Design a binder for these strands. Sequence first.
RNA 1: CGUGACUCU
RNA 2: CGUGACUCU
Lengths: 120, 120
Amino acid sequence: MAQPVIEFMCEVLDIRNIDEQPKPLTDSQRVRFTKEIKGLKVEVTHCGQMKRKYRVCNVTRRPASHQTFPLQVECTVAQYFKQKYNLQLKYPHLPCLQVGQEQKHTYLPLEVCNIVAGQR
Amino acid sequence: MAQPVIEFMCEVLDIRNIDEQPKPLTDSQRVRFTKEIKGLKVEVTHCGQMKRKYRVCNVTRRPASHQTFPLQVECTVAQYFKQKYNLQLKYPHLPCLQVGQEQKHTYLPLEVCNIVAGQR
RNA sequence: CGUGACUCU
RNA sequence: CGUGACUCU
């Protein structure tokens, strides 16, 4: 089965009450989490059966609530997911996973992400 | 599970003794088989764990023993599989499945082919 | 199987 | 999930 990246994170950062503290990650927490999530493959979970797979290439420093990209202007990913998918993010304070070609600015909220299990 | 294309063929052509008659397919048999195999996805079975998947785009008229392509000159696929994989084909008389971009000449002996099952 | 790509962000 | 691509032929 696929493990929610949120859960993967809580295991990495040794968090149990993820929803108890709506506090942002510290630089120390972001750095430890990035080392672990970078390089892994994730599958999206907000597009029904179109579970697109991405390669995590980095973690943003800014939270989903502020991370921005070139929108055709520039938009905040939280809005985008509430405007294009009508999804009020549950963790706008946590960062997004940057995926795909660096020079492409694809940011994915942790919420909609599951770690894909390899199948050798 | 993946079904050998040989088996798929015998079902299409209503053949039971595939190995009893080492006779080539008739134009009628080739045409009926092509209608069914064209468009299907197959996975290769002669490269260990590298089960590459191809899209069947057509069936050759010439048998594996004669079908040719631009080899870097031109070679017969039977030889190629006996020279590059040291695989004396079991059915050099049956045709090959052409796969991928038409203008690329990729021919696959039926032997090394399994029909890939979709996973909706 | 592994990788990279699109329907993205 | 679907598609198309490479390690092909």
